[PDB]
Ligand SMILES: Nc1nc2c(ncn2[C@@H]2O[C@H](COP(=O)(O)OP(=O)(O)OP(=O)(O)O)[C@@H](O)[C@H]2O)c(=O)[nH]1
Ligand SMILES: Nc1nc2c(ncn2[C@@H]2O[C@H](COP(=O)(O)OP(=O)(O)O)[C@@H](O)[C@H]2O)c(=O)[nH]1
Ligand SMILES: COc1ccc(CNc2c(-c3ccccc3O)nc3ccc(F)cn23)cc1
Ligand SMILES: [Ca+2]
Ligand SMILES: [Ca+2]
Ligand SMILES: [Mg+2]
């Protein structure tokens with residue numbers, strides 16, 4: 001047991017679920033049709049991979065997940081794509097009409113038409129579970145469904161499942177791939193209404209991922225397929241502690257104890273290494289010290305901020321592959337003397353380490369190199385508040401003139417919600433400043 | 441007084457507790473399935489203290505194995521000596537305790553404790569004369585810490601006249617699962633001060649340093665630390681497990697070691713430290729056991745004073761030489777033993793050595809320098825608690841800030857009390 005249910009909302013959520021679930025299937029040797037040769041226990045089992053996959057009596061391993069979107073085009077491609085047999089048709093849920101880049105339609109108007117159906121299906125998966133750990137919610141900040149349906153869902157999930165843990169992987173909007181002028185409004189509304197209901201939230205900055213694809217993978221103009229393949233690697237590093245056995249494997253909840261010092265401070269910065277092309281990885285084995293060092297290079301981060309001009313409250317290293325504790329300790333010793341790492345005066349400065357032996361894998365016909373070892377750093381730094389600040393400034397520019405506000409008010413929202421949400425983010429920015437101030 | 445009932449709680453509790461049963465089962469000639477293939481009658485003479493006799497002359501450890509998750513306890517059953525434990529005494533929950541004291545003490549563990557007490561009562565009843573209970577646990581996680589101290593409180597209620605022993609593993613940043621350890625430890629120390637007669641303080645700081653500095657293990661595992669723990673546990677139970685003049689029991693130990701009831705935190709020590717070929721002379725054992733480098737608690741005994749001492753020599757050796765050497769360190773370092781408890785060092789010798797060594801020494805000290813341990817944990821605690829950091833994990837299971845304040849105060853009082861006798 002310790003089962004984990006994934007919920008994928010809107011286009012970004014859906015397309016990242018594909019990347020993720022395609023990746024998890026390759027990681028565990030599960031074929032497209034759902035069969036898993038190396039699983040001798042047919043119909044069920046207690047194995048670590050069973051946290052993400054139920055078994056049917058016919059030998060089908062089936063994702064503990066639900067894809068939800070308010071229009072059929074993105075989910076229709078899962079219904080007819082390589083992995084169509086993997087999912088039960090009732091896990092793939094669509095409406096007829098989207099939220100149209102409007103938090104309000106996603107939360108109220110189009111959203112309340114499909115919400116009972118979504119909870120009903122989430123419930124059907126929850127009852128296949130002998131000891132459900134919690135949910136993982138994948139969604140964009142900027143979309144209408146991703147922002148407003150997710151918020152509605154999170155609220156409702158807190159009611160049906162109490163305090164059962166809820167993690168978010170949230171896509172933070174970037175101008176290179178942005179689809180709507182109103183993304184800053186959607187972002188601040190979802191962030192605000194989700195903050196009491198989420199226990200931990202990994203932000204992914206599309207720009208950060210966009211820059212990494214250009215710089216490290218030599219990709220001239222990355223598509224979503226390029227970004228999601230990189231994201232799934234990061235997601236996989238984080239969930240790998242849930243999906244694999246291991247002597248040196250620290251569970252993800254144990255990292256969370258360290259990552260979240262107050263309920264509102266639940267936004268860890270992730271950083272992944274190595275991201276390298278096959279061309280460049282040939283005759284170029286990257287040691288534990290090199291990838292560990294790469295975690296403190298802020299070009300390898302998932303969110304554009306500078307931890308060097310801020311303070312750490314935690315630092316977790318999730319290694320996978322050919323890694324042993326000795327090399328890790330030596331690598332950390334080198335970094336402590338040679339790099340810009342200042343903790344707040346109320347945290348202990350120890351780095352928490354976890355190691356999975358299963359080395360990372362790559363999706364066929366991708367841009368990443370297959371490497372012998374890899375690492376995801378999860379840090380809690382005050383620097384991440386930079387990301388809130390940039391986004392809060394864009395919100396303030398538009399909100400001062402009331403640009404676009406009529407589109408939200410027409411679907412039933414009030415001006416009160418906007419300023420209530422912005423003050424919550426003002427307070428959150430002030431919280432991230434307070435934690436960094438030294439004690440007396 | 442013979443029968444002891446052993447309980448092991450949580451990851452650490454069950455890991456070290458498994459090694460203890462491995463070590464002493466070899467010493468008493470019991471094999472991985474439970475049969476006696478020994479040679480000396482001295483091996484079976486007080487086998488009753490820790491083992492029950494079963495159908496077919498099998499010996500079954502009087503051991504209750506407790507955890508809130510089945511991870512560690514499936515490993516114990518998998519491991520070398522697992523098949524010896526009575527299968528009804530495996531009592532386990534499903535969801536674990538997430539290194540949270542509150543979950544162990546107040547919510548998750550509360551659900552499970554009454555089942556553990558039914559096995560305790562089962563083992564307690566088929567005992568000729570129960571002397572007491574020993575618990576193995578760490579103070580830093582949530583099950584062995586919080587649930588463990590909940591058990592202790594319940595056992596004291598039902599058996600208020602029996603002795604309570606702990607082997608309590610104190611935490612260190614040098615070997616650290618989570619930032620909340622100082623919180624968990626401070627909540628458990630508050631329990632231990634009130635509800636135990638004796639506690640062996642195994643500091644993981646001290647085990648790491650012995651492993652690093654004195655044994656040349658650059659990257660020490662929990663296996664390397666537990667090697668040191670089970671040799672210390674073997675040593676401080678020798679006098680209960682073997683003969684033959686010392687009618688040593690847990691109550692006698694409590695009476696002679698503990699001049700003031702709250703000051704029952706013992707610093708253990710072992711010589712020689714291992715992981716040899718040249719056997720040690722009695723002078724060397726006597727220098728080594730008293731050395732700071734050989735203490736299982738990270739405290740300089742020169743910074744404090746010894747209230748009482750109990751030393752236990754194992755092997756064939758001259759008792760003349762053992763008295764001479766034990767009297768030499770007292771006479772040559774007399775400032776470090778309190779003048780107001782005459783003859784506070786008591787020494788014993790047992791002919792059977794442990795596996796591997798021809799001769800060895802185990803030290804049990806109630807030193808006032810133990811305060812340094814509680815000061816170290818008090819400091820780590822305050823660093824965080826002054827900004828109420830990480831508290832939401834505890835307040836979400838119904839605990840209040842006042843309960844942390846209380847606990848911080850009891851420990852700081854303990855420290856004051858130890859400091860009181862260092863200067864008297
Ligand atoms: N990383 C990544 N970002 C995406 C993907 N698809 C869309 N986005 C980003 O997500 C934001 C737009 O939200 P979507 O998820 O398309 O919108 P939606 O939730 O479907 O909402 P509506 O379409 O308005 O109902 C923009 O910031 C896009 O760049 C994807 O596959 N990967
Ligand atoms: N010496 C030693 N310490 C341990 C062992 N296992 C865990 N610890 C320590 O115990 C503390 C964590 O407690 P743990 O027993 O895992 O938690 P619980 O299962 O929730 O009681 C930390 O200080 C760890 O360093 C072990 O086998 N030996
Ligand atoms: C002032 O110190 C003491 C006086 C009396 C006792 C009672 N029994 C005991 C013990 C002892 C008792 C219980 C468990 C383990 C033990 O190793 N070890 C010795 C060694 C020498 C001796 F004279 C008695 N010992 C303990 C300490
Ligand atoms: Ca199976
Ligand atoms: Ca329960
Ligand atoms: Mg859409």
Ligand SMILES: [Mg+2]
Pocket residue numbers: 451581617
């Ligand atoms: Mg642990």
